[PDB]
Amino acid sequence: SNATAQQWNKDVVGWNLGNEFECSAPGQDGESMQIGNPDGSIHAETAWGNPVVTKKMIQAVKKAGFNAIRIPIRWQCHITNAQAMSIDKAWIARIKEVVGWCLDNGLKVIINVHHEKWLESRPTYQYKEENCQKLALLWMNIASEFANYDSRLAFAGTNEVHIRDNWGKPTAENLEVQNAYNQIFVDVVRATGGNNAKRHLILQTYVCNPWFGIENGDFIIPKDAEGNGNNYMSVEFHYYQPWSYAGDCTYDYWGDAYKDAGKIPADNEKTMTDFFDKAVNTWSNKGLGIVIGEWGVTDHYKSNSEKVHENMTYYCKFLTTEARKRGFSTFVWDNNHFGNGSEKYGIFDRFKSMKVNAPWILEGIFGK
DSSP states (O other): OOOOHHHHHTTOEEEEOTTSTTSOSTTSOTTOOOOSOOTTGGGGGGTTSOOOOOHHHHHHHHHHTOOEEEEOOOOGGGEEETTTTEEOHHHHHHHHHHHHHHHHTTOEEEEEOOSOHHHHTOOSGGGHHHHHHHHHHHHHHHHHHTTTSOTTEEEEOOSOOOOTTOOSOOOHHHHHHHHHHHHHHHHHHHHTOGGGGSOOEEEEOGGGOGGGTSSTTOSOOOOOSTTOTTTTEEEEEEOOOSHHHHTSOSOSOOSGGGTTTSOOOSOOHHHHHHHHHHHHHHTGGGTOEEEEEEEOOOOOOSSOHHHHHHHHHHHHHHHHHHHHHTTOEEEEOOOSOOSSSTTOOOOEETTTTTEESOHHHHHHHHOO
């Protein structure tokens, strides 16, 4: 099988297996940059309160209408030799079990390197050589283990690279190191040859904020293997935008369509389509795919949950449809957390037979 990035992304409407395989080892600091294989780390998927992932969980996501799953994976607490970045065999086996569940049930898959804090938290010249060496070694091991899987499996090299507690624009130094991460990733995966020569590779903008890559060549398109051009790579960003609606609950409503229902952000439907057009002109028109690797609106309302949830349906339908019609793939964030406030991105209740607890989201993505 052989699919370009744009072909791979076409009509992909996906879902994130959030707060599972990227949790830290039980009882350990998620911000730790230590590399090792501490006792109990094979149980990391339960370390932040979520359950062990089962096949029926994967099958329920498929049956809801999703056709791809993004699997966040942290590796730093599953390393048997920090110098070689060798991976615990039991951890590889567990990941392959879940990847196989997805592939066997008609889902495309993204695996990545996620919350890998020695890498994400140190994008500086001080650590550039060490981090590029370790990332090279880590991806050599991941790419080798997953080399025989078909084109439905894509690799995303990193997640959100940034100085701890700093979500703003990178320095020139930060951006140089983080662009180097992307090139090292492409280099070592293509060097494993075989099926990995044309696998879909997914590269991140700085802290997955598209505005930190889309101007001035800030995001450097890597040099891929001879002949591939840009056709087998995507640019990934995350798009919880506008954050004042989707993330921090400043606004309960969004869009000129709901301007009479309550206060809305200045960022509206046109802001979003203007941005999506900019991504087409800047990246898609150079042959690259576009992956919206995370998006979503936290469940929040000060009152009138019916109208707020109707507006979220509108937002979900608008974002996913306008992205899809430009050829992007999208992956909604889901952390199995329910409530009213921040970080409430759960859709399916993973503790209760994947009951749909946020039907307003699925009605927006797939229809009533």
